[PDB]
PDB file of all heavy atoms in Angstrom:
ATOM      1  N   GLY A   1      75.292-130.245 -93.175  1.00  0.00           N
ATOM      2  CA  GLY A   1      75.692-131.609 -93.409  1.00  0.00           C
ATOM      3  C   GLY A   1      74.925-132.285 -94.520  1.00  0.00           C
ATOM      4  O   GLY A   1      73.869-131.822 -94.960  1.00  0.00           O
ATOM      5  N   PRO A   2      75.450-133.404 -94.997  1.00  0.00           N
ATOM      6  CA  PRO A   2      74.848-134.068 -96.149  1.00  0.00           C
ATOM      7  C   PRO A   2      73.626-134.873 -95.756  1.00  0.00           C
ATOM      8  O   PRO A   2      73.388-135.165 -94.583  1.00  0.00           O
ATOM      9  CB  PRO A   2      75.971-134.986 -96.637  1.00  0.00           C
ATOM     10  CG  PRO A   2      76.661-135.376 -95.372  1.00  0.00           C
ATOM     11  CD  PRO A   2      76.542-134.203 -94.419  1.00  0.00           C
ATOM     12  N   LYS A   3      72.847-135.226 -96.768  1.00  0.00           N
ATOM     13  CA  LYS A   3      71.751-136.151 -96.571  1.00  0.00           C
ATOM     14  C   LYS A   3      72.178-137.549 -97.004  1.00  0.00           C
ATOM     15  O   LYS A   3      73.166-137.729 -97.720  1.00  0.00           O
ATOM     16  CB  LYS A   3      70.525-135.699 -97.357  1.00  0.00           C
ATOM     17  CG  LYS A   3      70.034-134.288 -97.030  1.00  0.00           C
ATOM     18  CD  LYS A   3      69.388-134.183 -95.656  1.00  0.00           C
ATOM     19  CE  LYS A   3      70.365-133.684 -94.602  1.00  0.00           C
ATOM     20  NZ  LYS A   3      69.702-133.487 -93.284  1.00  0.00           N
ATOM     21  N   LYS A   4      71.420-138.547 -96.564  1.00  0.00           N
ATOM     22  CA  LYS A   4      71.744-139.947 -96.837  1.00  0.00           C
ATOM     23  C   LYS A   4      70.592-140.555 -97.627  1.00  0.00           C
ATOM     24  O   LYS A   4      69.568-140.942 -97.064  1.00  0.00           O
ATOM     25  CB  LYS A   4      72.012-140.697 -95.548  1.00  0.00           C
ATOM     26  CG  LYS A   4      73.197-140.155 -94.777  1.00  0.00           C
ATOM     27  CD  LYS A   4      74.492-140.778 -95.267  1.00  0.00           C
ATOM     28  CE  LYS A   4      75.686-140.265 -94.481  1.00  0.00           C
ATOM     29  NZ  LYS A   4      76.974-140.691 -95.092  1.00  0.00           N
ATOM     30  N   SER A   5      70.771-140.633 -98.942  1.00  0.00           N
ATOM     31  CA  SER A   5      69.749-141.209 -99.801  1.00  0.00           C
ATOM     32  C   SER A   5      69.556-142.684 -99.487  1.00  0.00           C
ATOM     33  O   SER A   5      70.522-143.434 -99.324  1.00  0.00           O
ATOM     34  CB  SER A   5      70.131-141.031-101.272  1.00  0.00           C
ATOM     35  OG  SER A   5      70.298-139.661-101.594  1.00  0.00           O
ATOM     36  N   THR A   6      68.297-143.095 -99.399  1.00  0.00           N
ATOM     37  CA  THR A   6      67.953-144.485 -99.157  1.00  0.00           C
ATOM     38  C   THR A   6      67.766-145.200-100.493  1.00  0.00           C
ATOM     39  O   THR A   6      68.045-144.651-101.562  1.00  0.00           O
ATOM     40  CB  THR A   6      66.705-144.580 -98.284  1.00  0.00           C
ATOM     41  OG1 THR A   6      65.579-144.060 -99.003  1.00  0.00           O
ATOM     42  CG2 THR A   6      66.892-143.784 -97.004  1.00  0.00           C
ATOM     43  N   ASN A   7      67.288-146.437-100.444  1.00  0.00           N
ATOM     44  CA  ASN A   7      67.042-147.209-101.650  1.00  0.00           C
ATOM     45  C   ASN A   7      65.645-146.925-102.190  1.00  0.00           C
ATOM     46  O   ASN A   7      64.739-146.515-101.462  1.00  0.00           O
ATOM     47  CB  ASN A   7      67.204-148.703-101.377  1.00  0.00           C
ATOM     48  CG  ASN A   7      68.559-149.042-100.797  1.00  0.00           C
ATOM     49  OD1 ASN A   7      69.549-148.365-101.070  1.00  0.00           O
ATOM     50  ND2 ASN A   7      68.611-150.094 -99.987  1.00  0.00           N
ATOM     51  N   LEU A   8      65.482-147.154-103.489  1.00  0.00           N
ATOM     52  CA  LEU A   8      64.220-146.931-104.179  1.00  0.00           C
ATOM     53  C   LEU A   8      63.530-148.272-104.382  1.00  0.00           C
ATOM     54  O   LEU A   8      64.086-149.170-105.024  1.00  0.00           O
ATOM     55  CB  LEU A   8      64.446-146.232-105.520  1.00  0.00           C
ATOM     56  CG  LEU A   8      63.256-146.190-106.480  1.00  0.00           C
ATOM     57  CD1 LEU A   8      62.064-145.507-105.831  1.00  0.00           C
ATOM     58  CD2 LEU A   8      63.641-145.490-107.775  1.00  0.00           C
ATOM     59  N   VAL A   9      62.325-148.405-103.833  1.00  0.00           N
ATOM     60  CA  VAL A   9      61.517-149.609-103.974  1.00  0.00           C
ATOM     61  C   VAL A   9      60.214-149.217-104.652  1.00  0.00           C
ATOM     62  O   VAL A   9      59.485-148.353-104.151  1.00  0.00           O
ATOM     63  CB  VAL A   9      61.240-150.285-102.622  1.00  0.00           C
ATOM     64  CG1 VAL A   9      60.354-151.504-102.815  1.00  0.00           C
ATOM     65  CG2 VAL A   9      62.546-150.671-101.946  1.00  0.00           C
ATOM     66  N   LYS A  10      59.920-149.851-105.780  1.00  0.00           N
ATOM     67  CA  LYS A  10      58.745-149.548-106.579  1.00  0.00           C
ATOM     68  C   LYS A  10      57.768-150.718-106.539  1.00  0.00           C
ATOM     69  O   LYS A  10      57.975-151.712-105.837  1.00  0.00           O
ATOM     70  CB  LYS A  10      59.153-149.217-108.015  1.00  0.00           C
ATOM     71  CG  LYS A  10      59.958-150.313-108.683  1.00  0.00           C
ATOM     72  CD  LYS A  10      60.044-150.095-110.179  1.00  0.00           C
ATOM     73  CE  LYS A  10      60.761-151.248-110.858  1.00  0.00           C
ATOM     74  NZ  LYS A  10      62.201-151.291-110.485  1.00  0.00           N
ATOM     75  N   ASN A  11      56.683-150.578-107.301  1.00  0.00           N
ATOM     76  CA  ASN A  11      55.649-151.600-107.440  1.00  0.00           C
ATOM     77  C   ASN A  11      55.002-151.960-106.108  1.00  0.00           C
ATOM     78  O   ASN A  11      54.385-153.023-105.982  1.00  0.00           O
ATOM     79  CB  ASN A  11      56.204-152.861-108.111  1.00  0.00           C
ATOM     80  CG  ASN A  11      56.790-152.580-109.477  1.00  0.00           C
ATOM     81  OD1 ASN A  11      57.994-152.725-109.688  1.00  0.00           O
ATOM     82  ND2 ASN A  11      55.943-152.175-110.413  1.00  0.00           N
ATOM     83  N   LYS A  12      55.126-151.093-105.107  1.00  0.00           N
ATOM     84  CA  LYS A  12      54.586-151.353-103.782  1.00  0.00           C
ATOM     85  C   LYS A  12      53.966-150.081-103.229  1.00  0.00           C
ATOM     86  O   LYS A  12      54.392-148.974-103.569  1.00  0.00           O
ATOM     87  CB  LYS A  12      55.674-151.865-102.832  1.00  0.00           C
ATOM     88  CG  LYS A  12      55.140-152.551-101.588  1.00  0.00           C
ATOM     89  CD  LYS A  12      54.861-154.019-101.850  1.00  0.00           C
ATOM     90  CE  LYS A  12      56.121-154.751-102.280  1.00  0.00           C
ATOM     91  NZ  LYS A  12      55.861-156.195-102.529  1.00  0.00           N
ATOM     92  N   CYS A  13      52.957-150.244-102.379  1.00  0.00           N
ATOM     93  CA  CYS A  13      52.297-149.112-101.736  1.00  0.00           C
ATOM     94  C   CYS A  13      53.185-148.634-100.595  1.00  0.00           C
ATOM     95  O   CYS A  13      53.183-149.211 -99.506  1.00  0.00           O
ATOM     96  CB  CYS A  13      50.913-149.520-101.244  1.00  0.00           C
ATOM     97  SG  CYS A  13      49.976-148.236-100.384  1.00  0.00           S
ATOM     98  N   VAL A  14      53.960-147.578-100.845  1.00  0.00           N
ATOM     99  CA  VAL A  14      54.990-147.138 -99.909  1.00  0.00           C
ATOM    100  C   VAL A  14      54.791-145.673 -99.547  1.00  0.00           C
ATOM    101  O   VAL A  14      53.919-144.994-100.101  1.00  0.00           O
ATOM    102  CB  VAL A  14      56.396-147.363-100.494  1.00  0.00           C
ATOM    103  CG1 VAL A  14      56.612-148.832-100.815  1.00  0.00           C
ATOM    104  CG2 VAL A  14      56.591-146.510-101.733  1.00  0.00           C
ATOM    105  N   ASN A  15      55.599-145.179 -98.612  1.00  0.00           N
ATOM    106  CA  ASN A  15      55.613-143.772 -98.218  1.00  0.00           C
ATOM    107  C   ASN A  15      56.880-143.150 -98.797  1.00  0.00           C
ATOM    108  O   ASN A  15      57.984-143.399 -98.304  1.00  0.00           O
ATOM    109  CB  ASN A  15      55.563-143.623 -96.702  1.00  0.00           C
ATOM    110  CG  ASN A  15      54.194-143.920 -96.132  1.00  0.00           C
ATOM    111  OD1 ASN A  15      53.181-143.755 -96.807  1.00  0.00           O
ATOM    112  ND2 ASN A  15      54.157-144.353 -94.879  1.00  0.00           N
ATOM    113  N   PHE A  16      56.720-142.342 -99.838  1.00  0.00           N
ATOM    114  CA  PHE A  16      57.862-141.777-100.540  1.00  0.00           C
ATOM    115  C   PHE A  16      58.181-140.374-100.035  1.00  0.00           C
ATOM    116  O   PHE A  16      57.351-139.698 -99.424  1.00  0.00           O
ATOM    117  CB  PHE A  16      57.604-141.748-102.046  1.00  0.00           C
ATOM    118  CG  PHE A  16      56.269-141.178-102.425  1.00  0.00           C
ATOM    119  CD1 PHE A  16      56.076-139.809-102.488  1.00  0.00           C
ATOM    120  CD2 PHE A  16      55.207-142.013-102.724  1.00  0.00           C
ATOM    121  CE1 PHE A  16      54.848-139.286-102.837  1.00  0.00           C
ATOM    122  CE2 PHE A  16      53.978-141.495-103.074  1.00  0.00           C
ATOM    123  CZ  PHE A  16      53.799-140.130-103.133  1.00  0.00           C
ATOM    124  N   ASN A  17      59.414-139.944-100.304  1.00  0.00           N
ATOM    125  CA  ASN A  17      59.852-138.593 -99.964  1.00  0.00           C
ATOM    126  C   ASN A  17      61.000-138.233-100.897  1.00  0.00           C
ATOM    127  O   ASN A  17      62.112-138.747-100.734  1.00  0.00           O
ATOM    128  CB  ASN A  17      60.274-138.506 -98.502  1.00  0.00           C
ATOM    129  CG  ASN A  17      60.585-137.086 -98.062  1.00  0.00           C
ATOM    130  OD1 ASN A  17      61.380-136.383 -98.687  1.00  0.00           O
ATOM    131  ND2 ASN A  17      59.948-136.653 -96.980  1.00  0.00           N
ATOM    132  N   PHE A  18      60.732-137.357-101.861  1.00  0.00           N
ATOM    133  CA  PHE A  18      61.729-136.904-102.828  1.00  0.00           C
ATOM    134  C   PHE A  18      61.970-135.419-102.590  1.00  0.00           C
ATOM    135  O   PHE A  18      61.257-134.574-103.141  1.00  0.00           O
ATOM    136  CB  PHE A  18      61.271-137.166-104.261  1.00  0.00           C
ATOM    137  CG  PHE A  18      61.109-138.621-104.593  1.00  0.00           C
ATOM    138  CD1 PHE A  18      59.962-139.305-104.232  1.00  0.00           C
ATOM    139  CD2 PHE A  18      62.101-139.302-105.275  1.00  0.00           C
ATOM    140  CE1 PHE A  18      59.811-140.642-104.540  1.00  0.00           C
ATOM    141  CE2 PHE A  18      61.956-140.639-105.585  1.00  0.00           C
ATOM    142  CZ  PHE A  18      60.811-141.309-105.217  1.00  0.00           C
ATOM    143  N   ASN A  19      62.973-135.109-101.769  1.00  0.00           N
ATOM    144  CA  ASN A  19      63.353-133.731-101.463  1.00  0.00           C
ATOM    145  C   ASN A  19      62.187-132.930-100.890  1.00  0.00           C
ATOM    146  O   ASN A  19      62.023-131.748-101.196  1.00  0.00           O
ATOM    147  CB  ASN A  19      63.923-133.028-102.696  1.00  0.00           C
ATOM    148  CG  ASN A  19      65.395-133.308-102.893  1.00  0.00           C
ATOM    149  OD1 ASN A  19      65.957-134.203-102.264  1.00  0.00           O
ATOM    150  ND2 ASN A  19      66.030-132.543-103.772  1.00  0.00           N
ATOM    151  N   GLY A  20      61.368-133.565-100.054  1.00  0.00           N
ATOM    152  CA  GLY A  20      60.247-132.901 -99.426  1.00  0.00           C
ATOM    153  C   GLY A  20      58.893-133.181-100.040  1.00  0.00           C
ATOM    154  O   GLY A  20      57.898-132.601 -99.588  1.00  0.00           O
ATOM    155  N   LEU A  21      58.817-134.045-101.050  1.00  0.00           N
ATOM    156  CA  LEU A  21      57.543-134.430-101.649  1.00  0.00           C
ATOM    157  C   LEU A  21      57.028-135.670-100.927  1.00  0.00           C
ATOM    158  O   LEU A  21      57.492-136.785-101.183  1.00  0.00           O
ATOM    159  CB  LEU A  21      57.700-134.686-103.144  1.00  0.00           C
ATOM    160  CG  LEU A  21      57.555-133.469-104.059  1.00  0.00           C
ATOM    161  CD1 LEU A  21      58.793-132.591-104.004  1.00  0.00           C
ATOM    162  CD2 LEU A  21      57.268-133.905-105.486  1.00  0.00           C
ATOM    163  N   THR A  22      56.063-135.476-100.033  1.00  0.00           N
ATOM    164  CA  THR A  22      55.551-136.538 -99.181  1.00  0.00           C
ATOM    165  C   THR A  22      54.215-137.042 -99.711  1.00  0.00           C
ATOM    166  O   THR A  22      53.417-136.269-100.248  1.00  0.00           O
ATOM    167  CB  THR A  22      55.383-136.053 -97.740  1.00  0.00           C
ATOM    168  OG1 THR A  22      54.391-135.021 -97.695  1.00  0.00           O
ATOM    169  CG2 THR A  22      56.699-135.508 -97.207  1.00  0.00           C
ATOM    170  N   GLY A  23      53.982-138.338 -99.554  1.00  0.00           N
ATOM    171  CA  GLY A  23      52.734-138.933 -99.984  1.00  0.00           C
ATOM    172  C   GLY A  23      52.802-140.441 -99.897  1.00  0.00           C
ATOM    173  O   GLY A  23      53.823-141.025 -99.520  1.00  0.00           O
ATOM    174  N   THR A  24      51.684-141.063-100.257  1.00  0.00           N
ATOM    175  CA  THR A  24      51.544-142.513-100.257  1.00  0.00           C
ATOM    176  C   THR A  24      51.045-142.964-101.621  1.00  0.00           C
ATOM    177  O   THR A  24      50.106-142.374-102.166  1.00  0.00           O
ATOM    178  CB  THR A  24      50.580-142.975 -99.162  1.00  0.00           C
ATOM    179  OG1 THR A  24      50.992-142.434 -97.901  1.00  0.00           O
ATOM    180  CG2 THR A  24      50.563-144.494 -99.072  1.00  0.00           C
ATOM    181  N   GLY A  25      51.667-144.001-102.168  1.00  0.00           N
ATOM    182  CA  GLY A  25      51.252-144.508-103.458  1.00  0.00           C
ATOM    183  C   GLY A  25      52.203-145.579-103.951  1.00  0.00           C
ATOM    184  O   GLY A  25      53.112-146.008-103.238  1.00  0.00           O
ATOM    185  N   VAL A  26      51.970-145.999-105.189  1.00  0.00           N
ATOM    186  CA  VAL A  26      52.760-147.035-105.842  1.00  0.00           C
ATOM    187  C   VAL A  26      53.563-146.382-106.957  1.00  0.00           C
ATOM    188  O   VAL A  26      52.999-145.709-107.829  1.00  0.00           O
ATOM    189  CB  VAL A  26      51.875-148.164-106.390  1.00  0.00           C
ATOM    190  CG1 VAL A  26      52.716-149.170-107.160  1.00  0.00           C
ATOM    191  CG2 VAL A  26      51.123-148.845-105.257  1.00  0.00           C
ATOM    192  N   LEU A  27      54.876-146.582-106.930  1.00  0.00           N
ATOM    193  CA  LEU A  27      55.769-146.002-107.919  1.00  0.00           C
ATOM    194  C   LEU A  27      55.993-146.979-109.064  1.00  0.00           C
ATOM    195  O   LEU A  27      56.084-148.192-108.853  1.00  0.00           O
ATOM    196  CB  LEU A  27      57.109-145.628-107.282  1.00  0.00           C
ATOM    197  CG  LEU A  27      57.165-144.360-106.425  1.00  0.00           C
ATOM    198  CD1 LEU A  27      56.530-144.575-105.061  1.00  0.00           C
ATOM    199  CD2 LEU A  27      58.600-143.893-106.272  1.00  0.00           C
ATOM    200  N   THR A  28      56.077-146.445-110.280  1.00  0.00           N
ATOM    201  CA  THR A  28      56.309-147.268-111.456  1.00  0.00           C
ATOM    202  C   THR A  28      57.005-146.436-112.522  1.00  0.00           C
ATOM    203  O   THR A  28      56.946-145.203-112.514  1.00  0.00           O
ATOM    204  CB  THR A  28      55.003-147.851-112.005  1.00  0.00           C
ATOM    205  OG1 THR A  28      55.297-148.761-113.072  1.00  0.00           O
ATOM    206  CG2 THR A  28      54.100-146.746-112.525  1.00  0.00           C
ATOM    207  N   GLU A  29      57.658-147.132-113.449  1.00  0.00           N
ATOM    208  CA  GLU A  29      58.412-146.469-114.504  1.00  0.00           C
ATOM    209  C   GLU A  29      57.494-145.641-115.393  1.00  0.00           C
ATOM    210  O   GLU A  29      56.332-145.992-115.616  1.00  0.00           O
ATOM    211  CB  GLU A  29      59.164-147.497-115.349  1.00  0.00           C
ATOM    212  CG  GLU A  29      59.895-148.555-114.543  1.00  0.00           C
ATOM    213  CD  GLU A  29      61.026-147.973-113.717  1.00  0.00           C
ATOM    214  OE1 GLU A  29      61.604-146.949-114.136  1.00  0.00           O
ATOM    215  OE2 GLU A  29      61.341-148.542-112.651  1.00  0.00           O
ATOM    216  N   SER A  30      58.026-144.533-115.902  1.00  0.00           N
ATOM    217  CA  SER A  30      57.282-143.624-116.760  1.00  0.00           C
ATOM    218  C   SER A  30      58.079-143.338-118.023  1.00  0.00           C
ATOM    219  O   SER A  30      59.312-143.299-117.996  1.00  0.00           O
ATOM    220  CB  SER A  30      56.971-142.312-116.042  1.00  0.00           C
ATOM    221  OG  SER A  30      56.083-141.515-116.806  1.00  0.00           O
ATOM    222  N   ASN A  31      57.362-143.138-119.128  1.00  0.00           N
ATOM    223  CA  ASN A  31      57.962-142.807-120.411  1.00  0.00           C
ATOM    224  C   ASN A  31      57.818-141.329-120.757  1.00  0.00           C
ATOM    225  O   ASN A  31      58.128-140.928-121.885  1.00  0.00           O
ATOM    226  CB  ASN A  31      57.351-143.673-121.513  1.00  0.00           C
ATOM    227  CG  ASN A  31      55.835-143.612-121.529  1.00  0.00           C
ATOM    228  OD1 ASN A  31      55.225-142.786-120.849  1.00  0.00           O
ATOM    229  ND2 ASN A  31      55.218-144.494-122.307  1.00  0.00           N
ATOM    230  N   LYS A  32      57.355-140.514-119.813  1.00  0.00           N
ATOM    231  CA  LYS A  32      57.164-139.093-120.058  1.00  0.00           C
ATOM    232  C   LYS A  32      58.506-138.403-120.263  1.00  0.00           C
ATOM    233  O   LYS A  32      59.553-138.921-119.866  1.00  0.00           O
ATOM    234  CB  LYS A  32      56.417-138.447-118.894  1.00  0.00           C
ATOM    235  CG  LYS A  32      54.936-138.772-118.857  1.00  0.00           C
ATOM    236  CD  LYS A  32      54.354-138.522-117.479  1.00  0.00           C
ATOM    237  CE  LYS A  32      52.963-137.926-117.571  1.00  0.00           C
ATOM    238  NZ  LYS A  32      52.543-137.298-116.290  1.00  0.00           N
ATOM    239  N   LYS A  33      58.470-137.232-120.894  1.00  0.00           N
ATOM    240  CA  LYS A  33      59.679-136.464-121.184  1.00  0.00           C
ATOM    241  C   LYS A  33      59.604-135.135-120.440  1.00  0.00           C
ATOM    242  O   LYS A  33      59.079-134.142-120.946  1.00  0.00           O
ATOM    243  CB  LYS A  33      59.846-136.259-122.685  1.00  0.00           C
ATOM    244  CG  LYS A  33      60.442-137.457-123.401  1.00  0.00           C
ATOM    245  CD  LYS A  33      60.449-137.257-124.905  1.00  0.00           C
ATOM    246  CE  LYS A  33      61.020-138.475-125.610  1.00  0.00           C
ATOM    247  NZ  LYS A  33      62.486-138.602-125.381  1.00  0.00           N
ATOM    248  N   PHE A  34      60.141-135.122-119.225  1.00  0.00           N
ATOM    249  CA  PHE A  34      60.294-133.881-118.485  1.00  0.00           C
ATOM    250  C   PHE A  34      61.280-132.960-119.194  1.00  0.00           C
ATOM    251  O   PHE A  34      62.209-133.403-119.875  1.00  0.00           O
ATOM    252  CB  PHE A  34      60.788-134.155-117.065  1.00  0.00           C
ATOM    253  CG  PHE A  34      59.700-134.503-116.092  1.00  0.00           C
ATOM    254  CD1 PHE A  34      59.484-135.813-115.713  1.00  0.00           C
ATOM    255  CD2 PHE A  34      58.908-133.515-115.542  1.00  0.00           C
ATOM    256  CE1 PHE A  34      58.489-136.130-114.811  1.00  0.00           C
ATOM    257  CE2 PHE A  34      57.914-133.829-114.642  1.00  0.00           C
ATOM    258  CZ  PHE A  34      57.703-135.135-114.277  1.00  0.00           C
ATOM    259  N   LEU A  35      61.067-131.660-119.028  1.00  0.00           N
ATOM    260  CA  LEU A  35      62.052-130.693-119.468  1.00  0.00           C
ATOM    261  C   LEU A  35      63.280-130.776-118.562  1.00  0.00           C
ATOM    262  O   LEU A  35      63.183-131.209-117.411  1.00  0.00           O
ATOM    263  CB  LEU A  35      61.460-129.286-119.457  1.00  0.00           C
ATOM    264  CG  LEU A  35      60.641-128.916-120.695  1.00  0.00           C
ATOM    265  CD1 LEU A  35      60.436-127.413-120.782  1.00  0.00           C
ATOM    266  CD2 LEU A  35      61.306-129.443-121.958  1.00  0.00           C
ATOM    267  N   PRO A  36      64.454-130.373-119.065  1.00  0.00           N
ATOM    268  CA  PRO A  36      65.692-130.565-118.296  1.00  0.00           C
ATOM    269  C   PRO A  36      65.673-129.918-116.921  1.00  0.00           C
ATOM    270  O   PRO A  36      66.298-130.425-115.986  1.00  0.00           O
ATOM    271  CB  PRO A  36      66.757-129.924-119.193  1.00  0.00           C
ATOM    272  CG  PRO A  36      66.203-130.044-120.565  1.00  0.00           C
ATOM    273  CD  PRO A  36      64.722-129.866-120.421  1.00  0.00           C
TER     274      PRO A  36
END
């Protein structure tokens, strides 16, 4: 079955989870250039 993506809230000390990447921190925009 499918997963249900939640909303993205930044600039706050939150508990994130991106496809199994767990941790605590503050999210913010980045100008880095990841490879495709």
Side-chain angles (χ1 to χ4, degrees):
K3 303 289 97 176
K4 298 274 181 189
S5 301
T6 66
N7 304 330
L8 168 58
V9 178
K10 56 166 184 292
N11 302 115
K12 198 86 60 180
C13 179
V14 301
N15 286 333
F16 48 81
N17 187 307
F18 296 81
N19 276 13
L21 273 76
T22 64
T24 307
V26 175
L27 283 76
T28 186
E29 314 295 331
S30 189
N31 53 10
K32 285 161 141 197
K33 279 174 181 289
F34 276 102
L35 277 196

